[PDB]
Amino acid sequence: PCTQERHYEHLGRCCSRCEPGKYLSSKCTPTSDSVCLPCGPDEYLDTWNEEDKCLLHKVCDAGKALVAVDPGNHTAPRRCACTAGYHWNSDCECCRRNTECAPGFGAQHPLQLNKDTVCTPCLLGFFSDVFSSTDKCKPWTNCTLLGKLEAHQGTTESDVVCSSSM
Template sequence: MVLLRLRCLLWGCLLSTVHPEPHITCGENQYVTNNHCCDMCQPGKKLVNDCTEFTTTECVSCKTGEFLDTWNRERHCHQHKYCDPNLGLKVQKEGTSDTDTTCRCDEGLHCTTNACESCTQHTPCPPGLGVKQVATGVSDTVCDPCPAGFFSNVSSALEKCHPWTRSPGSDKSPGGDPHHNGDSARCPAGVGLYQKGDQGARE
């Protein structure tokens, strides 16, 4: 009798090994717990209690200043981002229960990362370089060397290269290459250059 019981126990172990419990596959926005498929909490809500055979998943809304932006089974909501004015940040859009707060930089500054967690000054283009692309709140200034016939003699995050022109009444082309820093070009006798906006010609 004892031997029979041992044989039955052995066969029971083998059968349980060969025939495991079926794998549970849940639907979209569901999760498995205690051999049940429970519905996840929708964005803006957090999990309080898992579902059971007789009850559904229990969720509650995130509090003011908190959010969850995906279907989830989280027990805690995330805090909204703080736009620290000491870092040059200000609120671009207030967060909700299912979206985070977004920040932007003050005028003259741009974000240092995609998440915009801090800001830095726009880079000015030095003399000899002009602004190819003006900085935005999320990108820095793009500078480009002034081409022949153009100049920049200031350091600026806004100024483009300015063209040199011939003096009024001159029918000759100016010589030299004044495009780097705005210095007067070496011109043939009687021919002068002037910058747009200047009152007098340079010779």
């Protein structure tokens, strides 16, 4: 009668599994319990296991625009993320270029690492005249700062126009 986790049955006897960070070197015999040895350098196992050998940490390949956010250890996996301007895509297993928001749209802030840009339409009093994956909607120019008057109002795609009277 073995506990489903932390224990395993073999040769009709209850045997203890290996703790995370260790692998099963050899199964329990009639004379002894399991032999569990620590994972090698850059190797790991994150669960209570019965594994033949340990897993090798993935490479956060800079050549793939990847960088480590969590380095991992004998107990935990290494975690990678696409560097700025890119997001992970699980179809290509690659770091894809972030979506650009059209004019009249801005990038939702704050900008998430490893996640694609979300585009929102600019609100009244704000505009965007560019395709950009980073830029939010900027506010219309206030003509008084320029010492001028508002000639015509801006849109969500273009800025206000200022003119000097006489």
